[PDB]
DNA sequence: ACTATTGCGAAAAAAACATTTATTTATAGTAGCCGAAAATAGTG
DNA sequence: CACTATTTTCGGCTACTATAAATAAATGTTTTTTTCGCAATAGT
């Protein structure tokens, strides 16, 4: 969802690079693991069990 | 004085206030307050 | 021991510095030959046909001179001067038609070349004002050299095409 | 853990030095990726995404196979069992669950 | 020293009572330049007195490229003479001046970050976007810029007299903390 | 605050036996007993949207949270002061949080904000000065380059003896601070050269390109700096040798007046030239204009047989009025149907 | 942009130490090696009173805003200060940790 | 299948409003691209 | 030992934001809101 917002642009469709914005979602796997270990309750989606 | 000393650099230094948190001679950033010279009193029981 | 480039010690992983720097000159080398030549499931198949390359972090490096207006203008020639000074002498100062005379040259730098000729040769532009007369009669060849590309008398031919178009409104 | 360019072990914070700063004793995640920049496709190495908090005495930590001399320099107890995380200070451990 | 700041560009606009058409003033001119897709007006350039003319399709007109002051009124009225060829009234009533720029020389190297620390509440700059400093002076409501070479461009005078009392104001204020 | 008997102004709380009563000091009467402890929407929707976006780049630049929350108030006022309208969304937040980064005097530059979004530096630099000018931010920290040297060493992955090469670099920079270069030059430039010179003398990690991956400035404009200090004073003393122990100032030579030279009572009011005398030179005839007559501008006129010839090429370069014409003709068709 | 300061040992009648301040030290950090009792602040922490006020982009009156908020050693028995270290967290943010 | 009731989705549009079109001073500062020249090293 | 060729070595140049301060018709878009369409879904 952070690339197709850009890919719907006429001028920014040739020179655009993807992993320049890889770092914006980088802090969603650290604070997700460090919360699940600190607060020992793991909220999943595929099984929906708490 | 005998101000803040480092953990493993173990180098006596006097940090000037509100300036840094690291030590010299190493980039290690955990430092201890040294024991005072002031006399203290105890018992023996 | 002057500060400019002695090889003098370990210099770990210097080859990625050397490989990208030497390849940088090759990048502009392709951009020189583009100028002189101008002087003269199914989507993944062509993605396989594209060039596959490994990224080295030194190559794509950016500075202040990046993503900005302008480029390097082609330096002018004496062959361009004689077609410049002749149209400069016939008209007063008209950037419009002379931009099409020089096919890949743009409106912007030919304006700058007028600014370039002001300080450089300030006496030739004083004669450009003074030259308001029929010149040495060789421009008639360059008159029809402008008229041989798409030979169509636009004083009479380039009327009917909108008369074709304005008739279409009266139909619809 | 390591990169593919330097091919070193790593440079990593000590765990006892980590537990006095309320930090998460972690290790980076590295992938390699290939994509289409444009006219050409391009493959890049060593993309960092996040930091993996890893248990002590595992083969990725620096305490693996010490000789109470590195561990003397890293002031950890040789008699410590290991097997627990140091997320943001306090040291926690995951218990062994069971079900039907 | 007795140095005078010379004046480089003088711009002015007048009103016109007649509405302009782009056909009848461009297609039988000499400095024919009008690109409707690029720019909605016609320019023309004369070698003497090296000024530049700019019109508007609504009727209005503005001039730039004038070095002196009386020479601006000379050039503006010669620009009206070509419009007398076309069947237009071509009248000029109000010769307003609003934009007078000057350049000067001081010719001793100065610091600029010293006054940027002292006179920082009222004037400031950014180094990596622009080399010089931007100076403000609200007492004549004049703004301008300085350099590290001493030479100071006195830009944007709405009145020719307005800069003169401002010109010798700052130069004693600048000369302090002189280098040695 | 005032006692009932002695009107005491200071109150002391007794924590000895955990009664937590509050007693005046003078006479000892209790003041209190039994303590009681405590055990638009579219305007909101656009800031909660923007709450995501300034937090977005803070993850990229390793920004700790006390800058991001501090810059939130700068965006909060600039929204209220009608600054947010017209400009792009990503431009108005990238210019916003740099101001907070300047107040902290951080190592972060400005060019790193333009990096991923693929614009020029002065693209988002253009909206920056419009922020500080319109919103009257008078005080501001100076762009001190001494911060940048300390941060460059970590990603420079140099030898373990990295503290001595910085302590030598800062004494170089402090010596170069008294020197006369960075006054209109760039803080990233001169701090990209002094750390380049200090690392030169001890290792060959200088490759003229590895530091450009750090400093982000051209290989040749830093070589200009390597020539620039050599020609002022006492560089040839320390070109080859000479341990970093001297304390000299030398001459004062900012490299601006040399090129100016190589190229080569107050002021009274009634001596400078006036303005209204030049206004009154030639008459102010409103409609008449036959007092500025001449012979070349009278001959400034079309060519009569080339009136059709000049327009033929002008209509040969016509494609706009071709394309413009059906826009008026479809306007007639769209008005009726 | 306001920090928290460690000002300490307010003085009285030609002497530094008040009954609460015999073990508070010069820097505001409690001195290593001496005992504490009830009362007797061992870390002096001062907080700005404009904890959530809006940033006025000026410096007009910022000189007197630090109200005291210390931590008093409770407990019924006299304990000693063993040692105290100070360091930084993962963000640039200082720590104070004394072990009684 | 197909028609109707629904919510959102996209786009107008409104109002504002900063962003572009051409001037002139330079001045110092980058930054890119180009030889200009000069020494140096392979190899005769 | 010495020629020939080349890789530096060194400017040289050309551009190029800036700056204000006008003028001004576009000339962009933005938020904010409102409009309008279609598909979304489910019951015809
Ligand atoms: Zn140390």
């Amino acid at each position: 969802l952070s690339i197709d917002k850009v890919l719907k642009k006429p001028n920014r469709a040739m020179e655009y690079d993807a992993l320049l914005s890889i770092n914006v979602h980088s802090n969603n796997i650290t604070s997700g693991l460090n919360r699940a270990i600190s607060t020992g309750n793991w909220s999943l989606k595929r099984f929906k069990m708490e | 004085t005998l101000k803040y000393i480092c953990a493993e650099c173990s180098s006596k230094l006097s940090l000037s206030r509100t300036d840094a948190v690291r030590c010299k001679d190493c980039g290690h950033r955990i430092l201890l307050k040294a024991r005072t010279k002031r006399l203290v009193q105890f018992e023996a029981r | 021991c002057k500060p400019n480039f002695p090889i003098g010690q370990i210099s770990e992983n210097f080859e990625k510095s050397k490989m990208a720097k030497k390849a940088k000159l090759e990048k502009r080398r392709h951009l020189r030959e583009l100028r002189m030549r101008a002087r003269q499931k199914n989507a993944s198949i062509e993605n396989e046909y594209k060039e596959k390359v490994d990224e080295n972090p030194f190559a794509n490096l950016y500075n202040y001179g990046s993503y900005g207006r302008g480029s390097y203008t082609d330096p002018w020639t004496v062959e361009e001067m004689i077609k410049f000074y002749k149209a400069l002498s016939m008209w007063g100062t008209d950037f419009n038609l002379i931009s099409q005379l020089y096919p890949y040259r743009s409106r912007k730098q030919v304006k700058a070349k007028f600014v370039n000729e002001e300080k450089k040769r300030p006496i030739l532009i004083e004669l450009a004002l003074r030259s308001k007369l029929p010149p040495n009669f060789d421009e008639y060849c360059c008159e029809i050299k402008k008229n041989i590309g798409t030979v169509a008398d636009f004083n009479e031919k380039l009327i009917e095409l909108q008369n074709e178009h304005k008739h279409h409104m009266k139909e619809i | 853990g390591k990169k593919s360019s330097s091919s070193t072990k790593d440079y990593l914070t000590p765990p006892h030095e980590c537990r006095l700063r309320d930090m998460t004793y972690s290790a980076p995640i590295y992938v390699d990726i290939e994509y289409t920049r444009g006219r050409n496709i391009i493959m890049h190495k060593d993309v960092e995404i996040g930091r993996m908090p890893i248990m002590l005495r595992s083969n990725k930590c620096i305490l693996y196979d010490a000789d109470e001399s590195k561990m003397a320099k890293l002031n950890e107890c040789p008699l410590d069992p290991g097997g627990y995380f140091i997320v943001n200070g306090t040291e926690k451990v995951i218990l062994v669950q069971e079900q039907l | 020293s007795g140095i005078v700041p010379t004046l480089q560009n003088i711009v002015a606009t007048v009103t016109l009572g007649c509405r302009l058409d782009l056909k009848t003033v461009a297609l039988h001119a000499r400095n024919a330049e009008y690109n409707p897709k690029r720019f909605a007006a016609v320019i023309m350039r004369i070698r003497e007195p090296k000024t530049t003319a700019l019109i508007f399709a609504s009727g209005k007109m503005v001039v730039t490229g004038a070095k002196s002051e009386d020479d601006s009124k000379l050039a503006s009225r010669k620009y009206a003479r070509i419009i007398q060829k076309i069947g237009f009234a071509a009248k000029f009533t109000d010769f307003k001046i609003q934009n007078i720029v000057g350049s000067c020389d001081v010719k001793f190297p100065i610091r600029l970050e010293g006054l940027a620390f002292s006179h920082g509440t009222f004037s400031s700059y950014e180094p990596e976007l622009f080399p010089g400093l931007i100076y403000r002076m609200v007492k004549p409501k004049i703004v301008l810029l300085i350099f590290v070479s001493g030479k100071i461009v006195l830009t944007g005078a709405k009145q020719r007299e307005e800069i003169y009392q401002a010109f010798e104001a700052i130069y004693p204020v600048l000369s302090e903390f002189r280098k040695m | 605050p005032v006692c009932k008997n002695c009107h005491g102004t200071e109150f002391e709380r007794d924590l000895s036996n955990a009664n937590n009563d509050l007693v005046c000091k003078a006479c000892g009467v209790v003041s209190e007993d039994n303590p009681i402890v405590s055990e638009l929407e579219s305007r909101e929707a656009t800031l909660n949207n923007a709450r995501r976006k300034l937090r977005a780049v803070s993850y990229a630049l390793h920004i700790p949270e006390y800058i991001t929350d501090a810059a939130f108030q700068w965006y909060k006022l600039a929204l209220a002061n009608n600054f947010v309208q017209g400009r792009r969304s990503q431009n108005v937040i990238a210019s916003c949080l740099y101001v907070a980064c300047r107040k902290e005097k951080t190592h972060h530059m400005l060019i790193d904000f333009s990096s991923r979004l693929q614009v020029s530096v002065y693209s988002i630099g253009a909206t920056f000065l419009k922020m500080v000018k319109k919103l009257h931010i008078t005080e501001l920290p100076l762009a001190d380059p001494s911060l940048f040297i300390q941060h460059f060493a970590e990603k420079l992955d140099l030898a373990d003896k990295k503290i001595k090469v910085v302590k030598d670099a800062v004494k170089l920079a402090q010596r170069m601070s008294k020197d006369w270069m960075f006054e209109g030059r760039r803080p990233a430039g001169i701090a990209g050269a002094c750390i380049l010179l200090a690392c030169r003398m001890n290792n060959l990690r200088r490759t003229h390109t590895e530091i450009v991956a750090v400093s982000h400035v051209a290989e040749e404009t830093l070589q200009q700096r390597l020539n620039e200090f050599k020609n002022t004073k006492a560089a040839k003393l320390s070109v080859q040798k000479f341990r970093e122990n001297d304390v000299e100032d030398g001459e004062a030579r900012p490299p601006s007046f040399v090129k100016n030279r190589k190229k080569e009572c107050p002021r009274n009011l009634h001596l400078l030239p006036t303005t209204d005398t030049y206004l009154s030179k030639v008459s102010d005839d409103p409609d008449n204009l036959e007092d500025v007559d001449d012979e070349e501008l009278n001959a400034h006129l079309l060519n009569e047989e080339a009136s059709k010839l000049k327009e033929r090429i002008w209509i040969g370069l016509n494609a706009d009025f071709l394309l413009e014409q059906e826009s008026k003709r479809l306007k007639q068709e769209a008005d009726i149907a | 942009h306001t920090q928290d300061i460690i000002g300490g040992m307010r003085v009285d009648e030609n002497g530094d130490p008040i009954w609460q301040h015999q073990s508070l030290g010069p820097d505001g950090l409690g001195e290593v090696g001496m005992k504490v009792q009830s009362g007797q602040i061992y870390i002096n922490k001062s907080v700005p009173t404009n904890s959530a006020d809006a940033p006025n982009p000026n410096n007009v009156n910022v000189q007197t805003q630090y109200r005291e908020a210390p931590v008093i050693y409770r407990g019924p028995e006299p304990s000693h200060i063993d040692q105290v270290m100070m360091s930084v967290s993962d963000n640039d943010q200082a720590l104070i940790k004394v072990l009684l």
Side-chain angles (χ1 to χ4, degrees), chain C residues 39-130 132-162:
Chain C
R39 298 289 92 189
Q40 69 183 357
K41 298 285 102 175
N42 52 4
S44 64
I45 295 173
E46 57 90 19
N47 286 317
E48 183 181 1
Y49 186 75
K50 289 181 178 182
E51 178 66 29
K52 187 182 264 79
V53 69
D54 52 347
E55 173 62 26
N56 45 353
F58 291 160
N60 53 0
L61 183 55
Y62 63 94
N63 58 354
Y64 285 85
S66 177
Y67 302 152
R69 195 264 304 171
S71 177
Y72 179 73
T73 61
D74 195 2
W76 298 86
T77 64
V78 184
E79 188 269 333
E80 282 172 344
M81 295 299 106
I82 47 94
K83 292 187 287 185
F84 182 78
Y85 290 159
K86 188 176 260 78
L88 164 140
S89 179
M90 289 184 281
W91 293 270
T93 174
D94 295 331
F95 288 156
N96 291 323
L97 78 162
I98 65 172
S99 66
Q100 283 74 243
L101 178 62
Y102 294 158
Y104 292 95
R105 301 294 183 91
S106 177
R107 183 260 183 275
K108 185 177 76 174
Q109 81 273 22
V110 302
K111 181 177 187 290
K113 189 58 192 289
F114 169 71
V115 180
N116 193 3
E117 289 291 328
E118 176 65 29
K119 271 73 65 178
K120 187 174 181 180
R121 292 178 182 175
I123 59 172
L124 275 75
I125 199 168
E126 289 175 354
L127 189 145
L129 179 70
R130 194 261 184 188
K132 296 296 184 291
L133 80 161
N136 290 320
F137 193 74
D138 203 3
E139 73 271 15
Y140 185 73
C141 182
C142 293
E143 178 67 33
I144 310 171
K145 189 265 297 297
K146 184 171 71 175
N147 299 321
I148 46 91
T150 310
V151 183
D153 291 330
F154 290 148
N155 300 120
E156 52 90 19
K157 192 262 181 182
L158 214 285
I159 293 174
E160 58 90 23
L161 83 169
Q162 75 177 1

Side-chain angles (χ1 to χ4, degrees), chain F residues 19-38 40-250 252 254-293:
Chain F
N19 289 318
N20 290 317
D21 291 331
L22 187 65
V23 186
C24 65
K25 185 175 174 66
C27 62
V29 181
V30 64
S31 67
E32 65 179 0
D33 54 353
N34 293 114
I36 300 167
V37 298
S38 66
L40 272 297
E41 186 177 2
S42 67
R43 186 264 306 278
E44 193 272 332
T46 186
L47 58 87
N48 196 4
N49 193 2
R51 187 178 296 275
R52 190 175 297 110
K53 292 182 174 65
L54 88 168
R55 286 176 180 173
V57 298
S58 66
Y59 293 163
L61 281 309
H62 304 87
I63 305 302
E65 297 292 326
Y66 61 93
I67 296 99
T68 304
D69 292 331
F72 181 77
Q73 288 87 21
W74 297 102
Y75 182 77
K76 187 176 181 180
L77 58 92
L79 189 146
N81 288 113
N82 210 163
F83 190 82
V84 69
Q85 298 297 323
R87 295 181 180 91
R88 291 180 177 178
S89 67
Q90 45 81 26
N91 291 326
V92 77
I93 51 96
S95 177
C96 184
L97 88 166
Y98 181 77
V99 181
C101 291
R102 179 168 287 173
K103 296 295 291 294
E104 291 290 329
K105 297 184 287 185
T106 189
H107 60 85
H108 295 91
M109 294 180 287
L110 185 141
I111 71 171
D112 43 0
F113 290 158
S114 69
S115 67
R116 77 275 299 158
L117 207 140
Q118 202 261 328
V119 299
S120 76
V121 49
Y122 62 90
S123 175
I124 63 102
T127 186
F128 180 71
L129 71 152
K130 269 71 175 172
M131 184 182 288
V132 61
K133 187 265 298 294
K134 187 173 183 290
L135 277 304
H136 306 287
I137 298 98
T138 61
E139 58 91 19
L140 72 161
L142 192 274
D144 286 328
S146 64
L147 276 301
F148 298 156
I149 292 100
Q150 196 276 126
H151 188 267
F152 287 168
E154 284 84 3
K155 68 180 70 64
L156 213 278
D157 68 8
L158 60 102
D160 295 333
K161 295 181 183 293
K162 71 179 181 67
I163 304 300
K164 58 175 70 175
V165 306
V166 172
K167 181 64 71 70
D168 293 331
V170 63
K171 297 297 287 185
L172 174 61
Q174 184 64 42
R175 184 175 177 179
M176 188 265 176
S177 70
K178 292 181 180 180
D179 297 335
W180 290 82
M181 279 73 76
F182 61 106
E183 192 68 24
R185 288 174 178 86
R186 195 173 309 279
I190 55 98
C194 64
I195 194 167
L196 197 276
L197 195 275
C199 71
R200 182 256 181 185
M201 70 180 180
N202 296 323
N203 282 315
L204 206 270
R205 188 63 66 88
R206 182 269 308 272
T207 60
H208 292 287
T209 57
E210 290 181 353
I211 191 163
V212 175
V214 177
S215 177
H216 298 89
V217 67
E219 194 271 330
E220 66 275 16
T221 181
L222 53 91
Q223 181 59 253
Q224 190 273 335
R225 298 290 189 270
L226 297 173
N227 299 115
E228 186 169 359
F229 77 100
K230 188 174 73 174
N231 298 116
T232 168
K233 186 61 179 174
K236 56 97 176 179
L237 177 59
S238 64
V239 159
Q240 69 279 15
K241 206 173 76 175
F242 187 75
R243 307 281 80 80
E244 55 275 12
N245 56 11
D246 198 358
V247 280
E248 292 183 354
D249 53 355
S256 66
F257 75 102
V258 178
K259 300 286 103 176
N260 195 4
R261 182 64 178 172
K262 190 261 189 296
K263 182 178 73 174
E264 194 273 332
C265 65
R267 178 57 64 196
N268 50 358
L269 277 302
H270 293 88
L271 185 63
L272 57 93
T274 61
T275 178
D276 291 329
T277 58
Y278 296 97
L279 194 279
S280 64
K281 298 295 184 184
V282 194
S283 297
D284 290 329
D285 44 354
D287 53 353
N288 197 0
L289 50 93
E290 301 296 324
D291 50 353
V292 291
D293 293 335

Side-chain angles (χ1 to χ4, degrees), chain B residues 6 9-11 23-26 28:
Chain B
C6 180
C9 181
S10 68
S11 299
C23 64
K24 302 285 102 174
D25 298 334
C26 183
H28 188 269

Side-chain angles (χ1 to χ4, degrees), chain B residues 33-36 38-42, chain G residues 23 30-36 79-84:
Chain B
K33 178 181 257 76
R35 179 169 175 168
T36 185
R38 187 182 293 173
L39 187 146
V40 75
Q41 188 270 330
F42 284 96
Chain G
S23 65
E31 195 72 26
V32 173
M34 58 189 72
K35 69 171 71 174
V36 293
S79 64
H80 295 282
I81 293 171
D82 198 359
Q83 77 272 18
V84 53

